[PDB]
Design an enzyme around this catalytic site. Sequence first.
Site, mmCIF file in Angstrom:
data_model
loop_
_atom_site.group_PDB
_atom_site.id
_atom_site.type_symbol
_atom_site.label_atom_id
_atom_site.label_comp_id
_atom_site.label_asym_id
_atom_site.label_seq_id
_atom_site.Cartn_x
_atom_site.Cartn_y
_atom_site.Cartn_z
ATOM 1 C CG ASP B 530 -0.170 0.146 2.526
ATOM 2 O OD1 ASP B 530 -0.045 1.272 3.048
ATOM 3 O OD2 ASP B 530 0.296 -0.891 3.038
ATOM 4 C CE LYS B 599 -2.489 5.159 9.705
ATOM 5 N NZ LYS B 599 -3.824 4.531 9.540
ATOM 6 C CG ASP B 748 -5.887 0.330 4.108
ATOM 7 O OD1 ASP B 748 -7.006 0.475 4.640
ATOM 8 O OD2 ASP B 748 -5.136 -0.633 4.357
#
Lengths: 335, 887
Positions: B530, B599, B748
Amino acid sequence: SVPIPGIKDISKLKFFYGFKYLWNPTVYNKIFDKLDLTKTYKHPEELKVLDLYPGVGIQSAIFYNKYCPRQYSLLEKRSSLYKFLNAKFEGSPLQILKRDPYDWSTYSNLIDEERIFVPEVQSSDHINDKFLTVANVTGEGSEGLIMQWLSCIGNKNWLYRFGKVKMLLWMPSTTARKLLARPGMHSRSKCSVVREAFTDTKLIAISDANELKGFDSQCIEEWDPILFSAAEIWPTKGKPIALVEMDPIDFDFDVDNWDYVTRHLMILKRTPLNTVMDSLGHGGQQYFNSRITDKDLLKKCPIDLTNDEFIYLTKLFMEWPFKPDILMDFVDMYQ
Amino acid sequence: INFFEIYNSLPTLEEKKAFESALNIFNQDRQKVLENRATEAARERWKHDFEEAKARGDISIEKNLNVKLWKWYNEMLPLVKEEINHCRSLLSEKLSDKKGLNKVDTNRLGYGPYLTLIDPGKMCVITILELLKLNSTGGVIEGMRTARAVISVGKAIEMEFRSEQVLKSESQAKILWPQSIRARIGSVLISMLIQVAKVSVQGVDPVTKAKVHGEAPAFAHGYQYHNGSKLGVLKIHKTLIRQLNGERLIASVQPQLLPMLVEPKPWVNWRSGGYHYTQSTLLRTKDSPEQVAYLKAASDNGDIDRVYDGLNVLGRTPWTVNRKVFDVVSQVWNKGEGFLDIPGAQDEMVLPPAPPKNSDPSILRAWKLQVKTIANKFSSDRSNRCDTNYKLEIARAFLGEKLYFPHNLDFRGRAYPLSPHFNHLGNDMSRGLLIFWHGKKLGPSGLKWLKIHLSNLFGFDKLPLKDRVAFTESHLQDIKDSAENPLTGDRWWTTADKPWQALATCFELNEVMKMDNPEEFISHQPVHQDGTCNGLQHYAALGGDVEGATQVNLVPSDKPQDVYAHVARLVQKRLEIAAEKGDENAKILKDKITRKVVKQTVMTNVYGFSKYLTKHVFSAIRELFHSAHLIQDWLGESAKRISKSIRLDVDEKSFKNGNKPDFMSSVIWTTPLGLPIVQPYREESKKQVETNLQTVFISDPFAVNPVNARRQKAGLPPNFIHSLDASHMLLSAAECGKQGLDFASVHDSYWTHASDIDTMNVVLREQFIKLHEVDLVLRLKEEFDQRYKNYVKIGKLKRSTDLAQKIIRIRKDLSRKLGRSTTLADEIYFEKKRQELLNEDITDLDALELENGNSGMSVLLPLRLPEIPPKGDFDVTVLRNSQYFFS
DNA sequence: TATCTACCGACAATATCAATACTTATT
DNA sequence: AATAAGTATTGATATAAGTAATAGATA
């Protein structure tokens, strides 16, 4: 002799948060004659008064000039109102304190930690004759405060740990109509049942003649409230206000189970008891039918129930072997 | 038996293909059984259980609940067929007159025709099941909300009737019931269920302390005040709760949508595909009628063929339960202690000792809050443990066989597996349990990719590939210990970021280590690849940003760069300067800030006592990707303008206020693959519809509703990025499926075999190019200009004027003949529609001239979308070499 | 200039009760 | 041809009871 503020001074105060304060001294003379506070406070020269939300501070000055107590503590936080109160009552025997009446800590800090205001704990048979509390909770949004303070009478934990402290409460006329509603009336809700179970409450004065049509006619005859115009409330915009004398009384039920039962019965305050007892638990109607041997009570809607019938129903609820848990009645929103 | 073991046993691929061919035939019958409808499976299973138990005897064993359910069904069926008879006794009267003003006049005459449509036993099973499913939902502690329950039961009856109609129509070869009828029908059925469902309960009386037993209704309808506003609830008896939060719940309530054992039906149109027998739509979301309308039109045109290609490759990948991991999770489950994420069996909630009633209100309030917290945690753990047990039961059932997950799309276009309970898109344990059915020889590249996979799982994905391989090699002894002794050993795998998947790969690697030649080993373990924050990669590509692109690895670099770390460093410096300034908020929280908080905030931003962190993180990301911020501003402004636009044709005198037109336009755009996307942010209007139990405060989805402009504006950027992500995923899925790869995407990450990662990587890059070689912001603006051409916007008069063609457009004054200028006729007609001051005709046209010479008035501008921001120069085609683009 | 005041969206549901429109029952 | 009546329907308010949340320009 505290100098009383007039209409000249209190017109410059621009903000009031929604609170309305009577400024006519003659109406205050009439009110303090009607109350005859020297009947329950035999020695006024030793009484300790806690004034919450003093606002303009005319009731406070009049009370002091009439009775001259030992300590008068004005708990006013509002900035402009504190500024006025401290610029007008400087050097006077009044005590102006900048502490939020709403905050619980304010009382704990003042009574216990700072010890600035120390009442006298008394028994629970007579009205505490050394401690009187005055409050002006008039803001249309500050209605939960009155309910919380009424709950405190049941819990005996806020200021009613000093005995049966008498309260003089200014409040919206709709609040007074909610509280002072009698069984079966239109404005009968759980606040009125709480008032009936916990207090002995009279309507001392109202700010509108066309408001008394919402109270009990017999109760209006017994009380005989003073009537005054909205030309003596200073902020001349909002709803009418009403003064209420509130003396706690004794009670011998379980306040937790009574709170549960009353709160869950007064939801359907127009459904007869033949069908409203299943909202209490699983198999509630079967139980309360096998238990209530007065098959006439089973027909009265919870708006017709007096408080004694509510205590009877909570007594039956606490004998129920399969009663629910009155602690897990919240709605788990984290879910 | 274990089919997977037999498949692995076969030495030659031709033999494997022959065995698989036989397996499809042998599994066709089993698949048909799997797709059996809930009513039939539930009634047959619990009736069988009751009949068998009666012979065996009465006990409170695993089937005790099934016996109760069959008893309830049997003693509730007469009630409902009597209700049907009493509905027909007046439905044939044909005379609506002064009758019983409540029970038959408006209520029973309304739902009378709707009870007949379906046989009564189906309705009984449906109401029992739909109430069992709703245990502990909506905030209620041990029950459901009554509105949700009545609507769920009515809607399940509607769906069963329409399924019966579809089956009858295929065999022989209202439409959608209103919410009021759904509510009324559901309440009518659950009422009977409430009044027949009994459970035996014990209790110790307070007056005599004698242990007494007795029957009590299993359900009760009550109310609860939340924040001062009552809501009606349906509480379930605790005797039944013990069995709803029990290991045998799957026996009572089986899952209708399970992974299929045969290859899914290929998607050929929006309404057909996936399950062979069950019929499912191409959109997971059914609440919005407009989205389905556009999807149907697009499907009819046939322009979504690429979406089908991606969905069919996503669905045709065979999985299999990881038995090795399954045994370890089963052992931990049986142990009952709380493991990494498993809560651990708890009998009852333990509350702290109540404080004295005389204590001051703050103490009591704190205690009440603590009780709420303890109750919430207890209900949370029970829910988690029940979900885990359900998932492990599904895993245990499918342990031997090969299973396929058919996929569906959401409105944005993201693909989700059709089977909700057990799928590879779930929690870490669910992902750990599943592995690819097909085994591919690792090869030289595969061994490196498997090692890097383990390193990635342990959270060390920032480092370059050489370092990740070094980490695995350095921890080889730990891998051996974890695989050889999963629980009795040091449990090194438990420390991993994704422990169940880390354990599965540890098993794979341990097997590899025992082989003289690792490349020969065939690995079924999927490897996840990813990009760091796909949305940022798309913002960089659309913008053409150069500084931003480097952070997302768009441009090839020797060392992989992670956006999170760079923004964290920048925001750290920003907080450091803020702290130096003098605010203590930054100083107290500097240490607490970590990579995860950045994040999470960055992920939310690109996909949806301290307040400094959110503003600073947004400021840092904005500076890092200035082009992206400009595009986000353009998208938000365009959404706001579209939200305020009014369609010329739809405007009439229907508006409640003539001068206050409703805004019914929602942003609609087309994906590069052609899928239509319709932002479903409308303004709901709820009302109390009357039912037998209560009046439920429900909202009608058919009721056309003004669009929620605030959510539209807040939703264009994230939904556009999600559409681009889904487009890239479906393109790369189609390509990988063409090249012969098993492609699994968890939104993702993209998963494949370790021996295919390199291959897949190429495809990934290529498709990114194939998506961004065309200016997408420009194409979007052109599509907006076409779809929102003849709209008109309401405007204030507090800002400056933009152009000089509005003053003649609003009037529509110029002669329009000999050409089809019914737009001029139409625009003027709308003004006619708008209700200016008129009894006559030209009184708003000649007024605006004083505004055209202005004077404050709500003017009618034309809808003109802004010009796209300046596109920074960045050749995306330099991506063909970035070895850390997706990693 | 540095605290004072304003933004009620979770009264993100429901029972009850007064007011507003849609049939009538005699002369 | 009247003249009051009813109901079917909708909109309002109260409910519980720590008052969640932000700023906003101004005293």
